[PDB]
From a paper:
Natural empty particles (without RNA) are often also formed, in which the final RNA-mediated coat protein cleavage (between VP4 and VP2) is not made. The sedimentation coefficients and λ260/λ280 absorbance ratios were ∼160S and 1.67 for the mature virus, and ∼80S and 0.64 for the empty particle, indicating that the latter does not contain RNA, and SDS-PAGE showed that [name] is not cleaved into VP4 and VP2 in the empty particle. Diffraction data for inactivated CVA16 empty and full virus particles to 2.7- and 2.65-Å resolution, respectively, were collected at room temperature in situ. The natural empty particle is not expanded. The natural empty particle contains proteins [name], [name], and [name]. Residues lining the inner surface of the particle are more flexible (with higher B factors) and some residues are essentially disordered, and thus, residues 9 to 18 and 39 to 42 in [name] and 1 to 11 and 62 to 80 in [name] (corresponding to 1 to 11 and 61 to 69 of VP4 and 1 to 9 of VP2 in the mature particle) are not defined in the electron density map. The overall structure is otherwise essentially indistinguishable from that of the mature virus (RMSD of 0.3 Å for 813 Cα atoms), and the pocket factor binding site is fully occupied by a moiety that again resembles sphingosine. However, the inner surface of the empty CVA16 particle is much more ordered than the expanded EV71 empty particle, where the entire 69 residues of VP4 and residues 1 to 72 of [name] are invisible. The EV71 natural empty particles used in our earlier structural studies (produced by two independent companies) and those from a different strain used in another structural analysis were all in an expanded conformation, while using identical methodology, those for CVA16 described here are not (although we have observed an expanded CVA16 intermediate [135S] particle).
Enterovirus 71 (EV71) and [name] (CVA16) are subgroup A human enteroviruses (HEVA), small, nonenveloped single-stranded RNA (ssRNA) viruses whose protective capsid mediates cell entry and humoral immune responses. The external portion of the icosahedral capsid comprises 60 copies of viral proteins [name], -2, and -3 arranged with pseudo T=3 symmetry, while their N-terminal extensions and 60 copies of VP4 line the interior, surrounding the RNA genome. There is a “canyon” (a depression encircling the 5-fold axes) on the surface of enteroviruses that often harbors the receptor binding site, and there is a fatty acid binding site below the canyon base, within the hydrophobic β-barrel core of [name]. Here, we remedy this with high resolution X-ray structures of both mature and natural empty CVA16 particles and also of empty recombinant viruslike particles of CVA16 produced in insect cells, a potential vaccine antigen.
Author numbering:
A (entry chain B): 131 to 194
B (entry chain B), C (entry chain B): 11 to 60, 79 to 323
D (entry chain C), E (entry chain C): 1 to 242
F (entry chain C): 1 to 49
G (entry chain C): 147 to 194
H (entry chain A): 2 to 8, 19 to 38, 43 to 297
I (entry chain A): 150 to 198
J (entry chain A): 51 to 149
Amino acid sequence: RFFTLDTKSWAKDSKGWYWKFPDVLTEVGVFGQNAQFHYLYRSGFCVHVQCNASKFHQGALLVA
Amino acid sequence: GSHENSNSASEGSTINYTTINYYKDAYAASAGRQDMSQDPKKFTDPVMDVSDRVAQLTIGNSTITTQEAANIVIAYGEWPEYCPDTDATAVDKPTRPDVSVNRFFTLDTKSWAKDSKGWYWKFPDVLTEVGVFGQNAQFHYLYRSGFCVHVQCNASKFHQGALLVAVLPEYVLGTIAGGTGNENSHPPYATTQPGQVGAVLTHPYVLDAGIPLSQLTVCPHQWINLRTNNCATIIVPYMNTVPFDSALNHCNFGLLVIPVVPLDFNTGATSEIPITVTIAPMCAEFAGLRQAVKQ
Amino acid sequence: GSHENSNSASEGSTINYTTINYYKDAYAASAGRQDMSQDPKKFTDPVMDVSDRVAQLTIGNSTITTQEAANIVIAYGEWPEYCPDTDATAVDKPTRPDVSVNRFFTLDTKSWAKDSKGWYWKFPDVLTEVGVFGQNAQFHYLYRSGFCVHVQCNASKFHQGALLVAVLPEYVLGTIAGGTGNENSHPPYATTQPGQVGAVLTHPYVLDAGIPLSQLTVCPHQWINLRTNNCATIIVPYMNTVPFDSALNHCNFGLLVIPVVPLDFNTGATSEIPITVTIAPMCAEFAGLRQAVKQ
Amino acid sequence: GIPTELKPGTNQFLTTDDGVSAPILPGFHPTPPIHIPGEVHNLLEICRVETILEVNNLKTNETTPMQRLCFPVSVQSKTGELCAAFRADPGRDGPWQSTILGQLCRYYTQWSGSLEVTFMFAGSFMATGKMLIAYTPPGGNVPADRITAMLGTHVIWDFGLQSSVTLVVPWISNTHYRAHARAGYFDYYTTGIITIWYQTNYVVPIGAPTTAYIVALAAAQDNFTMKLCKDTEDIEQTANIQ
Amino acid sequence: GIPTELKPGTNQFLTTDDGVSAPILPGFHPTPPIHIPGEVHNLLEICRVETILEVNNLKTNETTPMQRLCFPVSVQSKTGELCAAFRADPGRDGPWQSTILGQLCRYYTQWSGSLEVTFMFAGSFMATGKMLIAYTPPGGNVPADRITAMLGTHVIWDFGLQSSVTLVVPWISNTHYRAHARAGYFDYYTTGIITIWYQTNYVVPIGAPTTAYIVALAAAQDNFTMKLCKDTEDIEQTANIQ
Amino acid sequence: GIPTELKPGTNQFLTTDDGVSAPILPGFHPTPPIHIPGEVHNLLEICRV
Amino acid sequence: ITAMLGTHVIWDFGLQSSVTLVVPWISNTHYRAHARAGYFDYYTTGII
Amino acid sequence: DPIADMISLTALQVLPTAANTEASSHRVVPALQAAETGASSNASDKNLIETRCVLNHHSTQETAIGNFFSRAGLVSIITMPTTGTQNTDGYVNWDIDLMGYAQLRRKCELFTYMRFDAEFTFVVAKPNGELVPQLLQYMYVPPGAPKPTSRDSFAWQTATNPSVFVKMTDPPAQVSVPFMSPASAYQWFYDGYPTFGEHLQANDLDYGQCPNNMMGTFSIRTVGIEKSPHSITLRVYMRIKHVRAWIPRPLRNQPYLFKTNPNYKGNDIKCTSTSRDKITTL
Amino acid sequence: LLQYMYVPPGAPKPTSRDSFAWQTATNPSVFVKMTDPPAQVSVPFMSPA
Amino acid sequence: ETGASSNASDKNLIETRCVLNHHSTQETAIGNFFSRAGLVSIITMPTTGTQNTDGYVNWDIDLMGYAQLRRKCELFTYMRFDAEFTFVVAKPNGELVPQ
Ligand SMILES: CCCCCCCCCCCCC/C=C\[C@H](O)[C@H](N)CO
Ligand SMILES: CCCCCCCCCCCCC/C=C\[C@H](O)[C@H](N)CO
Ligand SMILES: [Cl-]
Ligand SMILES: [Cl-]
Ligand SMILES: [Cl-]
Ligand SMILES: [Cl-]
Ligand SMILES: [Cl-]
Ligand SMILES: [Cl-]
Ligand SMILES: [Cl-]
Ligand SMILES: [Cl-]
Ligand SMILES: [Cl-]
Ligand SMILES: [Cl-]
Ligand SMILES: [Cl-]
Ligand SMILES: [Cl-]
Ligand SMILES: [Cl-]
Ligand SMILES: [Cl-]
Ligand SMILES: [Cl-]
Ligand SMILES: [K+]
Ligand SMILES: [K+]
Ligand SMILES: [K+]
């Protein structure tokens, strides 16, 4: 299912961010719990990155 | 007229009644003649086989090997089963963890003494904080499951005593009412939901609830008579007036272990005679996902 | 006996009831069992198509071109239609002017301000004194017609606000009863039949009639949300307990335009934001010719 | 109007009258039923279930009731001793009152059928011995000695052999049905007496208790039925329930 | 005359009894019916119609009620803030009372089914942003932060995208039917909590308002039904109507 | 309700009236009969003795 | 109570004199190299 | 397909009469039972003794739960006195709780769950048994419906609630009630709490309270703007009908103390059976 | 107003006008006014013989 | 914005299970909602006073004097029906007399 992690703020001088998988969810909801009780894990992922701005703003994020 | 609406409380049973009626609603009808059905083989003989001692049951990554067994009881003659679509009400797709939850958990051990009163545990209270089962119980609003109860107690061929192991649905406890009976006291959360450590009966004769122990055998039960067997096993199907329920606010049933024939042995023989409880939920289903709640 | 007269209030509907009866008159019968019919698609989805913004509707010598449209609503899922012979009662041959009356009339324009309360108009009061339609309404005792309502409101992509445009059949107004509620006051002709200029609501929350604006959407309606559309259109069929009626003494329904989400914009942007109402009667029929009467 | 005449009974309210009264909520539909294990249709289903007999119902137990749930056997010094005795009358005050069977038939005026009592030996595994269990039909008081009791319906049980044994109390009556027996004229419906004697002796080796207990379980057989539904004397509204 | 006996109920007047009474005008024929648009046969037809939710039901609005019909969103300075919260209990005092649905189910003791809430953004066209709307089933109080609420049933909405969005409140109950929830024992039938959070932020360019509003509309879905017809607490004969 | 009119005799108790009165014990089954010699059906059988 | 959460067997003497615990191959890799302290503790099999 | 691990025995029988007995003689171990299993001896007459054939026609119809329960019993006594502390108001609101009278209660508590319809009969009279020409109104106020605050309360308009109007002289009023729980069945025992939260000793009166059994209020009043001069006694009888029951349990063997719980007098714990002097003497 | 109740052998007999036995939850009882016609019921063959 | 109610259901916004729903809609039929007798008038004929020491009373038929019923009817604009009127009469204190 969809888990929504902390939000970051984009500033004119921001360097960039990164997250590790599955580190990010090891302590969240039922997923995390299963990850803790089990030695082995395997999974795929759906990543959704969101960022709104007016038609008067500009910039480009590379999500990889 | 005579043609009506289907709103009688007994319209979904394989037992029909002959009635008389002139109102559009069926519940207005008389009680009628009583058909004469009977199922005396679900209480008097809800045993396994409708070399029995010798055995081995496996579920999940756990396996029990019982040999001084007294066969196995299937409560009310019914096997645990995931909730069917006709009975279901909640619309979200339930999660059915399987192996991580349907397995054997072994709770604290109690010690049987010549003067022991007896103990009890509540389900599912006992596992709400154990392993993956507990976690699912906390993250979900709704829960439903069956149970396999295995009570163990060894002793030499020179010891004697008899434990009655029974399952009592909706085990509501009462207080001694201030003794005189003029105080309307109530059992504290710690007594109604003792957790995995269970609790001790103060008045076993009346099961701390104003009812005769002498009649407890009308419930799914089994005996552990030291000279015959050293363990008991009971499969329990889900029982409630609703398909799913909170594992936190409602205990579907309690497990009682009472020494009806007190432990005895000649001094010099092992005096530490423990009793151990191992349980395995069966067909666990959860629904109504949200954040974890402990109570 | 059992054979009777056909005099029950529910004898002309495609919904039958099972009853019991011993009197010669049908209305003496019980209410009976209720069939279980339903038409949830005439209130929850009485929209056009059961590039929608883009459009152009023509009737008479008038044509509207709407592009920031929110589709079109057909009130209660029914199209306007000349009165059928089974429902008709008056025997004289009605006059059906067609083009000279079934066309688009554009009434006075109102100005939407950040503090506007809301407005309303009555039908057919609004046209009783306009063009050929009005003239026919004056010369005839009886009138019957449907309506096409088009409400218009433009604004830049930097303005915001939302108008609820609704049709309320038999829009009976009430007074604030002297405030204390001890005075049985009544609305003057000028408030009940404001003419083509319409009137202003003093207490929109209760629609100046002791009923919640919050529930007005249970009536044929449409929204004009500035960021989405700038016009609304609603086709309205004739609604009354009689086939024809006086266009002077009875207003079949009222049109309400209320700012549920107030107009707002940054200073410097156009502040004059008008709202214009254009309406077209449909299938106008008149009968009972005599001399002209204004009221 | 149609010619009618009111007959006796008119206006009366018979608590057991099975008639038709008007419904308060027209068109109401009850929450549908779901499957629940353990449904019972006839009380008899319950009467066939063994519950514990308080054979050890002594005045000295009342303060330590758990002790009533089983009686003892121990190494005898004398042969053919009597271990315990009690009436087979199920609806009678006594040991049977503790059983679901006895409590239920107290909701009926008469009964008929065979009963069964199962005895379970809870001594050590090393203990052995044989007991004579007899049912003496009406007429004779409690048999004075084992040789007298032996003349009635009996079973000879051995522990080492099986831990439990079942004595059957055959329906042996003059009447097709018995009303609850009690002292007085109704002693006519007494069922009889059950006696437990030492056939041999409770033998045990060095190292094991010289006293052990037996649990008595009782229930009805398939031919058991009851009739004439009545109120039970076993419950009271001593004071007001608040 | 024919033998008859009067039974209990005789002479009583049950307000909901559906019987046959004698007609006062024999041979009378009612004015025939004509076609009238908008006929309804079942209340449920109405409950499926969205009406406005007074989410902004503050004590400070009571004198300017129109303000209760919509709540605001504005440029946030902090991430993941909570915009609004309210119970999903439809028959409960609160936001739902303003909807035709809530008013109607107050004429019934119990209900069952899924509900839907549609949110409409009425800000300027140049405003964009994403919101997280969640429904937290029974058990947990109001989620403290967005990361907690996110664990429940939710939808992630974007304005620029579509002006309206629909959150569905799935029927997730233990019982097949819920009675109206209120504080006390009946809190057992609570439906849960709805929370609206800022997924990203209300962004707007120079020239447009930094605060706009949202209108919440609510109604029932096709699986919705109600039972046990009762009187509503929402109307009173405070004084005499003249 | 159905149109009815009470006629004379209403409310009276005729000792020899052979009607139907409500049963006090629903579902009750009497002890079955057994064969007993000497059954008589009509007093005349006795008058011939 | 903690150990019980893993793969286990509950044995009784009176019953049978011998009992067999099975150590299922539960690894990430298809093969394990001999485990020892240090980096190779990665190939540890577990605890009984 | 690319994964291989992803690819009730007892029934009813109709017995109208008791089972028969067949003949046997002087002749496999059916006398000794293994009651340690939790099973009831399947040994009958023919096994332990020599028997005769008996054609048993004894009927089991009277022990059907329906004939056992469908007998009207007292579940409530409501009084409206004219002089006193009770209700010199002329009306009374009674929370529906049928557990105030033992005879009926003990019968129901034989089962854990029960589902049924019911016939309620209202026997009303003066406290001495006399009757007078007094008009009364009984009204059912479901959970959520406004309760009358007076004899004049608008709630007596009863536009939607069901009400009954009857004279104290008319026969007892009588009506049928459907199965109204929001659950599949009423339950006499609910081993739990109605809500979430910590269960401090202050809110322990919560334990055992099941909302699914709470059917609302029953209101009654004399029908008049003015006070009535007569004291009134209302006895409510209930007859269960169309019943189904589940999970039998031990029968109460201690006097009842409270409607809402199984509390018992701890100092005077009664023994289920009477006592005697010796185990060897009758 | 009167109450007649059948108390079969074994059933508790009322010890007073207030006795709990008048709850008549299982025994059959009849409630009738001295002004109503005579109460009347049918009784089956109840002997155990 | 169209004036339509969301045609989006469970299966669209979440993963669901199959549920065979047998809940009946018969009780919400307008007939079962309205066919419940309600108070529409209270007429008094006192012997001592200002009202009607005349022994008779003429009442203009208007059923809108009592809210419970009125609010229910005003849910609709137009209604067509037959009706059953019941006349409950007694003394002001609830007593009855041979009148
Ligand atoms: C105008 C006639 C009104 C009559 C309405 C009576 C409705 C009564 C319904 C029966 C409900 C069964 C009792 C249910 C639960 C128990 O009382 C609970 N233990 C109380 O907490
Ligand atoms: C001898 C029996 C006489 C009973 C006759 C009663 C007839 C009443 C007919 C019902 C009419 C429905 C009410 C109609 C309209 C409303 O009261 C109006 N708002 C009053 O202006
Ligand atoms: Cl950041
Ligand atoms: Cl029957
Ligand atoms: Cl331990
Ligand atoms: Cl311990
Ligand atoms: Cl004790
Ligand atoms: Cl109906
Ligand atoms: Cl203009
Ligand atoms: Cl203007
Ligand atoms: Cl306002
Ligand atoms: Cl007896
Ligand atoms: Cl955040
Ligand atoms: Cl609610
Ligand atoms: Cl009134
Ligand atoms: Cl029944
Ligand atoms: Cl009484
Ligand atoms: K006549
Ligand atoms: K006659
Ligand atoms: K009638």
